[PDB]
Structure 1
């Protein structure tokens, strides 16, 4: 009916699934994260006419490297997710994710989404980080990464406390608004 496909991507355990399910049901899956890689839909009211926002989840694990890209076709905006309290995923945004996306979808915009920020203050997570890199990604450093990789922008959220969250998706909606007739329509293919 006038679609907006947004494919979520990011290392594993980064909180991709919880982020979507949280956004869509307004309830963080506090007992079992649905093990199914599913699409989601939300009828957004952009302007005056409704738009179908297609939220697509992905399987991050390496095993899916050769398959994952299959869902990429016709995407409008991407969300490269990384857990604010696991530098691991953050490094991968650069070394793995952004490249993959660009490779397959060169004209498709993408936002850098920091996830699990609520944990930026959970001591045990900090005490665990101890391994010298006992430092959770800060907005300061993530932002530059956005600039370098050319992300439309950096937005961060907590699927647990709902903080930001919706914003991430508004930013996703606004970044995806393809032009009118223009042969320059970033819709991936």
Structure 2
């Protein structure tokens, strides 16, 4: 009867665009066009296998100032989204070093996906140059899929809030994983 409300907690470093993509998707607005909110967290209704689902996206701060409080929101979680930007090697690193350790400490059996962000920046000349001067290149899907299977993530998905590419699919998969 009444529609069911999936709990999805979103974690990752603080400048990988994670909140931006949560707001863009749930408001159906391009990243530059939404009215800023002083509130946290987002709800969106999505259709999967012909059926509607309310997706509750719980946003978290990726900063250390919040290591204590953040895990409080972890009980009752149906699925985790672990975000890093594909043009930020430190982001990717923190998936391995901080993020999946943290969520699997607290929720050993709750599924999670690896979410690659800002994929439209793989094409940005300036971004590629900045990475080059440190002998780095943007993360590829291949290398992200690997980390996903090695870490035991249900799968890897990636998107650009900017171009909207892959955005819908990311949350389609999050719901599929919770079910």
Output the TM-score relative to the length of structure 2. Answer: 0.92
Distance in structure 1 (CA, Å) of the matches to 2:99 and 2:11: 7
Q: RMSD over aligned Cα, in angstroms?
A: 1.8
Shift of 1:8: 0.8
CA contact (8 A) 1:115 1:156 kept: yes
For 1:74, the equivalent position in structure 2 comes to 76
**DSSP 3-state at the match of 1:142:** helix
In the TM superposition, what whole-angstrom CA distance separates every residue of 1:146-184 from its partner, at most 9, and x where no partner exists?
Answer: 01100000011001110001000001110111xxxxxxx
CA contact (8 A) 1:41 1:55 kept: yes
For 1:3, the equivalent position in structure 2 comes to 5
Distance in structure 2 (CA, Å) of the matches to 1:63 and 1:97: 15
Shift of 1:99: 0.3
CA contact (8 A) 1:77 1:172 kept: yes
The gaps in structure 2 that reach 5 residues or longer are none
For 1:183, the equivalent position in structure 2 comes to none
CA contact (8 A) 1:5 1:54 kept: yes
Distance in structure 2 (CA, Å) of the matches to 1:137 and 1:129: 11
Output the TM-score relative to the length of structure 1. Answer: 0.87
Of 97, 100, 104, which residue of structure 2 is paired with 1:98?
100
CA contact (8 A) 2:160 2:166 kept: yes
